[PDB]
Design a protein around this ligand. Structure first.
Ligand SMILES: [K+]
Length: 187
């Protein structure tokens, strides 16, 4: 019925199961952007709508865990809670970042090339990737590669300037705070 999240505040909730049509559509829309769809064929998928003081948020829950969201580009992205639940191996790529970059990303910055200390997986410009703090492998941001993985390998090694990854969702953003609270309530 309602939750109260940090930053976002009071949210009035409505939840429902995805229809069979909605489920098939979701799977079709995920397939091109990820190595694997992380959840089981038998997972329970629900759509949660949360209305706060500023507007409406929509999250797809996977067995109750707030995992997926539609962005303004019309593509479906994982929450950081999804990456905790399912790991990161199912993404096309991961970018490892230094401490200064991890902190900046947690504040809401895009990821710049000099903050990159490694690249895992193979991906092209435009692909969905996650940025992880190298030391602990903590996911801090989910976003869109601005360069190919092979290009980024040479660019970070020379500490070239420019944007490596365009941020879509990050640790401590409004969606993150909402997802935290949905997860807390599930517990
Ligand atoms: K799967």
């Amino acid at each position: 019925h309602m939750l109260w999240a940090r930053l976002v505040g009071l949210a009035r909730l409505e939840a429902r199961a995805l229809s069979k049509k909605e489920r098939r559509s979701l799977l079709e829309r995920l397939k091109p952007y990820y190595t694997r769809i992380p959840f089981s064929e038998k997972a329970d998928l629900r759509l949660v709508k949360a209305r706060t003081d500023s507007g409406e948020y929509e999250i797809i829950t996977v067995d109750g865990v707030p995992c997926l969201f539609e962005w303004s580009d019309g593509r479906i992205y994982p929450t950081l809670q999804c990456l905790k639940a399912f790991g990161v191996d199912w993404l096309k790529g991961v970018v490892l970042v230094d401490k200064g970059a991890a902190i900046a990303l947690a504040k809401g910055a895009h990821l710049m090339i000099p903050g990159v200390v490694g690249v895992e997986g193979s991906f092209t410009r435009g692909d969905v990737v996650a940025a992880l703090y190298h030391e602990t492998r903590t996911p801090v941001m989910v976003g869109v590669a601005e360069v190919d993985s092979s290009a980024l390998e040479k660019l970070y090694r020379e500490k070239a300037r420019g944007r490596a990854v365009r941020r879509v969702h990050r640790l401590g953003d409004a969606l993150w705070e909402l997802a935290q609270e949905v997860g807390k309530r599930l517990s």
